[PDB]
A paper describes a structure:
In the nucleotide pool, which is more susceptible to oxidation by reactive oxygen species than DNA, human MutT homolog 1 (hMTH1, human [name]) is the most prominent mammalian enzyme among other enzymes responsible for sanitization of the nucleotide pool. hMTH1 is characterized by broad substrate specificity as compared with Escherichia coli MutT; that is, hMTH1 hydrolyzes different oxidized nucleotides such as 8-oxo-[name], 2-oxo-dATP, and 8-oxo-dATP with almost the same efficiency, whereas MutT shows high substrate specificity for 8-oxoguanine nucleotides. Accordingly, hMTH1 prevents mutations and cell dysfunction by its hydrolytic activity toward both 2-oxo-dATP and 8-oxo-[name]. Here, we carried out structural and kinetic analyses of hMTH1 and demonstrated that hMTH1 shows broad substrate specificity for 8-oxo-[name] and 2-oxo-dATP because of the exchange of the protonation state at Asp-119 and Asp-120 depending on the substrate.
Author numbering: 1 to 156
The structure:
Amino acid sequence: MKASRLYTLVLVLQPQRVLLGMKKRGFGAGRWNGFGGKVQEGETIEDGARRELQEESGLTVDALHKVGQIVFEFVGEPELMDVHVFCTDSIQGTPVESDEMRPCWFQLDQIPFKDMWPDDSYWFPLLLQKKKFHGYFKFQGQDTILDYTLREVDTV
Ligand SMILES: Nc1nc2c([nH]c(=O)n2[C@H]2C[C@H](O)[C@@H](COP(=O)(O)OP(=O)(O)OP(=O)(O)O)O2)c(=O)[nH]1
Ligand code: NA
Ligand code: NA
C-alpha cells in the first residue's frame, strides 16, 4: 500500500479544438498538457482545478465537470499521483502565457500526442468521446510505461 497526493488536470474542450499548454519547466516540462497542479488544504478538488486553470492559463471559469481519475506511479517514487481530470467547453476570456505554461489551441484532428505524456494516447480518446474513465499507469522515468489499466466508467 502507498500514499497518494492529489493533483488536478483541466482540459478546455470545445467542438473543434482543445486548449493545451506547453509546460515550460517542472514536472512534464516539454510536453503539451492540460492545466493543473497540487490540490491545497481546504479547497475542494474542483476548486483547486479552477484555481490552477486561472493561475496557469489566465482563464476563469465558474464550473468544471469531472471526467476521469488517473493514478500515476513512478519507479523509485513511493508516493502515487492521484490526478482528477476535469473538462469544460465554456470560457469567456483569452488564455495568457504564465511562468508554467504557454497555452495554444489545437484542432481535434491535430492532437499533439507525440509531444504529450505517453499515457495520454490511451485516455485522451475517451475524453474526446465524452466518456468517463479511471486509469492507472506505472512509469519507468518519463517515457516508458511498465504496467497500466484503463476502464470506462459511468461515474467517476
Ligand atoms: N496529461 C497528463 N498529465 C499528467 C500526467 N502526470 C501528471 O502528473 N500529470 C499532470 C497533473 C498535474 O496537472 C501536473 C503535475 O503537477 P505539477 O507538477 O504541474 O504541479 P504544480 O503546478 O503544483 O507544480 P509546481 O508549480 O509546484 O512545480 O501534470 C500524465 O501522465 N499525463
Ligand atoms: Na500550478
Ligand atoms: Na502545474
